[PDB]
Design a protein around this ligand. Structure first.
Ligand SMILES: *[C@@H]1O[C@H](CO)[C@@H](O)[C@H](O)[C@H]1NC(C)=O
Ligand SMILES: *[C@@H]1O[C@H](CO)[C@@H](O)[C@H](O)[C@H]1NC(C)=O
Ligand SMILES: *[C@@H]1O[C@H](CO)[C@H](O)[C@H](O)[C@H]1NC(C)=O
Ligand SMILES: *[C@@H]1O[C@H](CO)[C@H](O)[C@H](O)[C@H]1NC(C)=O
Ligand SMILES: *[C@@H]1O[C@H](CO)[C@H](O)[C@H](O)[C@H]1NC(C)=O
Ligand SMILES: [Ca+2]
Ligand SMILES: [Ca+2]
Ligand SMILES: [Ca+2]
Ligand SMILES: [Ca+2]
Ligand SMILES: [Ca+2]
Lengths: 65, 130
């Protein structure tokens, strides 16, 4: 249930298998039903599909000290 | 050479021991560790056969092996907002500044080296930064 059509014609991601799926609770949860570790969120990479992992964060990225 | 020096002297860029045992590179510095050249290293201290890095299966404890394989970051200005030059890699990418410039912790910004302050021995009389 990674939201990818691995099994040829999309047969692995069908609703009757994935419908009640959840992922390890420490990981981030994404709008399209895909999970990436929480640190992946907002690192300029759209690791989750579309852009909901990056969307909304302020990209403060330098050593303020 | 048969000499005793205080422990603070052992690595301070001074040949206190005349044989130059003091200041030996193997003593004062550690090379970045690697693994067989036929292999690959993820962010964590792990080394895997290189073919595995893009096999769609997470190998590293941090799952960072598979993350980079699909993106040519230099062609994607959003991720690669580099100041001078960018180069792709099967995992992630690297960014580099032109000669005379240095890179900053965001690993994308470039800044101008004050060569006079950083290396005053460059000019025998006076130095001016540009
Ligand atoms: C800033 O850099 C110093 C080393 O130059 C490092 O010790 C420190 O942890 C860094 N701080 C942050 C917030 O990144
Ligand atoms: C690096 O970037 C500079 C400035 O854009 C450019 O003049 C130079 O040709 C580039 N070098 C390479 C190897 O891409
Ligand atoms: C997935 O999360 C749900 C909560 O919505 C339940 O905890 C369920 O037991 C979980 N199943 C697993 C182990 O993924
Ligand atoms: C060698 O490198 C490691 C990190 O890989 C540590 O920074 C360590 O302190 C280094 N040792 C010396 C003697 O510089
Ligand atoms: C990387 O480190 C290993 C272990 O020390 C071997 O020395 C190998 O030869 C090194 N390879 C490189 C690239 O220096
Ligand atoms: Ca799938
Ligand atoms: Ca991300
Ligand atoms: Ca010394
Ligand atoms: Ca892998
Ligand atoms: Ca890449």
């Amino acid at each position: 249930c990674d939201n990818d059509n691995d099994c040829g014609d999309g047969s692995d991601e069908l609703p009757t298998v994935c419908a009640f799926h959840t992922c390890r609770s420490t990981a981030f949860t994404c709008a399209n039903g895909r999970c990436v570790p929480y640190h992946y969120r907002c690192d300029f990479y759209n690791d989750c599909g579309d852009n909901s992992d990056e969307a909304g964060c302020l990209f403060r990225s330098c050593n303020s000290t | 050479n048969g000499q005793c020096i205080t422990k603070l002297y052992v690595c301070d860029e001074d040949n206190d021991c005349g044989d130059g045992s003091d200041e030996q590179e193997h003593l004062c510095h550690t090379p970045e560790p690697t693994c067989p050249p036929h292999q690959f290293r993820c962010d964590n201290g792990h080394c895997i056969e290189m073919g595995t890095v893009c096999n769609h299966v997470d190998d590293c404890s941090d799952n960072s092996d598979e993350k980079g394989c699909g993106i040519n970051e230099c062609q994607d200005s959003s991720i690669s907002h580099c100041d001078h030059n960018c180069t792709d890699t099967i995992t992630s990418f690297y960014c580099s500044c032109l000669p005379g410039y240095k890179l900053m912790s965001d690993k994308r910004t470039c800044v101008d080296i004050d060569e006079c302050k950083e290396t005053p021995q460059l000019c025998s009389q006076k130095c001016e930064n540009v």
